[PDB]
Design a protein around this ligand. Structure first.
Ligand SMILES: OC[C@@H]1O[C@@H](O)[C@H](O)[C@H]1O
Length: 302
């Protein structure tokens, strides 16, 4: 089987771990993976997908950067009789026959679990700064929606500052610096970061402001990357929800079934991770530091 995979980019360590996981799962399954990196631009994804259709691949997997603008290319794939699996983020389309299925976590559930954890931690008394993900990304929209739905139940919890950090470490840091300046000395209880990458940038801004991240300002997030588990083990951040980078597997199963002639296929197959905190961070970082450092030995190329 030849399968084209259109990846978003490399904005976070989570994302690059996802790319490495898909490549590793393809290899396990003897699949010829045409991997494309779009460098954060939807237009590059559309181009990759077009090329996959021109090359006559057996299936296409798309991790869509934003939700809009996919219908024309999906219709092209359909006319070409090439099944499409969506992974990670979502697309907004009016006809679900334009894809085979979607393999994803429940981002609203991720936002709900981390929000609940924070309310429990702070007994519902918490001024929060939000570092948002990229505009139009399902992961940002839905994590915000879920967190917001939990904190609406708690009158003494409120989001006092909210701005995009673009899912990146450098922009998370810059934004967090800005927040700390705008607070004008008023304590923040917590930072809610849509991903661990921005959260780790926030940690450095907090330190530079002479405050103790993980103690004075709580830091809660999503992804469960090893560097964040390390930070939790060190006391600098508090909690994250794990986001499995192994979505390729169920994507390849769905493709394998479709090619073998299976007709009955659900349109969404989903499982969501658990909240991890400092309580198990020493134990968990140990397990994760090698499932990690496999990737650190990989070879550099574009
Ligand atoms: O779509 C998943 C999100 O995108 C990545 O940028 C984040 O790290 C991850 O939570």
């Amino acid at each position: 089987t030849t399968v084209g995979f259109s990846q978003v980019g490399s904005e976070s360590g989570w994302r690059t771990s996802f790319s490495e996981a898909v490549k590793a799962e393809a290899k396990q399954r003897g699949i010829d993976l045409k991997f494309a990196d779009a460098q954060q631009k939807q237009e590059n994804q559309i181009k990759a997908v077009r090329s996959f259709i021109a090359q006559g691949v057996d299936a296409i997997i798309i991790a869509p950067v934003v939700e809009t603008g996919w219908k024309p290319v999906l219709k092209e794939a359909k006319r070409a009789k090439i099944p499409v699996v969506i992974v990670d983020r979502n697309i907004k389309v009016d006809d679900d026959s334009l894809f085979l299925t979607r393999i994803a976590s429940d981002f609203s559930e991720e936002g709900r679990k981390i929000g609940q954890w924070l309310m429990d931690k702070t007994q519902g008394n918490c001024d929060i700064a939000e570092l948002q993900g990229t505009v139009g990304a399902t992961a940002a929209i839905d994590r915000a929606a879920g967190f917001n739905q939990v904190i609406a139940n708690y009158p003494n919890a409120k989001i006092v500052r909210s701005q995009t950090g673009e899912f990146t470490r450098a922009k998370g840091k810059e934004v967090m610096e800005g927040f700390l300046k705008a607070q004008n000395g008023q304590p923040l209880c917590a930072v809610w970061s849509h991903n661990d990458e921005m959260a780790l940038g926030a940690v450095q801004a907090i330190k530079e402001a002479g405050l103790k991240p993980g103690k004075d300002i709580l830091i809660v997030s999503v992804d469960g990357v090893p560097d964040y588990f390390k930070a939790m083990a060190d006391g600098d951040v508090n909690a994250t929800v794990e986001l499995s980078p192994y979505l390729g597997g169920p994507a390849f199963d769905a493709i394998d079934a479709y090619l073998k002639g299976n007709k009955d296929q659900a349109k969404l197959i989903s499982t969501t991770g658990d909240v991890f905190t400092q309580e198990t961070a020493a134990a968990e970082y140990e397990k994760r530091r090698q499932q990690a450092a496999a990737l650190e030995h990989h070879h550099h190329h574009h």
